[PDB]
C-alpha cells in the first residue's frame, strides 16, 4: 500500500486538471516524497481506509478533481468515488502544507 | 462526533419537508436525545461513517427528503451523498422506532 507509482499510473483527473497540469505534477512530486505514515494517511483520507485492495493501488482508480482556484480552504475528499477534491493552489509549498494539514487530522 | 446542533444548522430538506414540518422537528428532538452510541450509529447509517469530517458535522450537508407516505418500511439513505430518505410517519414514537431499527440493524 506504499507503491504510489502504481497509484499514479491509474489516476485520472477532473474539474480542469490533466496529467500535465502544473498543480498535478507538483502533487505527485509531493506524495512520492511522503513517508510511509503520510502515504497511509492519504489513502485513508481519500479512500476511507489505508488497506490496499487486492490487485494493488491501481484498482482504486483515484480521481483528482479541481474544485476551485487558489484558496486557504483545505482539500476535501469523496471516499465513495476515491476522489481528492484539490483546489489549484498557487505554489507547491502551499499545496504540501494544505494537503498535509488535511490528512493529519486523524 | 456528537455535535448534532451543527448538523441541524446545515441540514437541507426536500420532497415537501421544511424546517417547520412537524415530523422534521420531531426528528431533531429524537436524535438530540440519542445516546452517544445511537448518534454514531446514525452517522454510520446516513453518511457511511461515524467519524466527523474536518470542520464538524456541519460540513456533512445532510439532506432529509420525503420518501413516500406513512408505512412500516424503514428509512433509507444514500451514504455517498449524506441523504436521509424518510417516509412521513404518523407519530414521533413510530419515527423513533423505525429510525432506531434502521440504524441498529444496518
Amino acid at each position: 500500500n506504499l507503491d504510489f507509482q502504481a497509484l499514479e499510473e491509474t489516476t485520472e483527473y477532473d474539474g480542469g486538471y490533466t496529467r500535465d497540469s502544473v498543480l498535478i505534477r507538483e502533487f505527485w512530486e509531493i506524495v512520492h516524497s511522503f513517508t510511509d505514515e503520510q502515504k497511509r494517511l492519504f489513502l485513508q483520507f481519500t479512500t476511507g481506509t489505508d488497506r490496499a485492495p487486492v490487485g494493488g493501488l491501481g484498482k482504486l482508480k483515484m480521481i483528482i478533481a479541481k474544485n476551485g482556484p487558489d484558496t486557504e480552504r483545505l482539500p476535501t475528499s469523496h471516499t465513495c468515488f476515491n476522489v481528492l477534491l484539490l483546489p489549484e493552489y498557487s505554489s507547491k509549498e502551499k499545496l504540501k502544507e494544505r494537503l498535509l494539514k488535511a490528512i493529519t487530522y486523524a | 462526533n456528537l455535535d448534532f446542533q451543527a448538523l441541524e444548522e446545515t441540514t437541507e430538506y426536500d420532497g415537501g419537508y421544511t424546517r417547520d414540518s412537524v415530523l422534521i422537528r420531531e426528528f431533531w428532538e429524537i436524535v438530540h436525545s440519542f445516546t452517544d452510541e445511537q448518534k454514531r450509529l446514525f452517522l454510520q447509517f446516513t453518511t457511511g461513517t461515524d467519524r466527523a469530517p474536518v470542520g464538524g458535522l456541519g460540513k456533512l450537508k445532510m439532506i432529509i427528503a420525503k420518501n413516500g407516505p406513512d408505512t412500516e418500511r424503514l428509512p433509507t439513505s444514500h451514504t455517498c451523498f449524506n441523504v436521509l430518505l424518510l417516509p412521513e410517519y404518523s407519530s414521533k414514537e413510530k419515527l423513533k422506532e423505525r429510525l432506531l431499527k434502521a440504524i441498529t440493524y444496518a
Partner: peptide, 14 residues
C-alpha cells in the same frame, strides 16, 4: 444522487 451536481467522475463510476 453530485446524478445533486455535474461531476463527470460520478457519471463515469455510477
Amino acid at each position: 444522487x453530485x446524478x445533486x451536481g455535474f461531476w463527470r467522475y460520478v457519471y463515469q463510476k455510477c
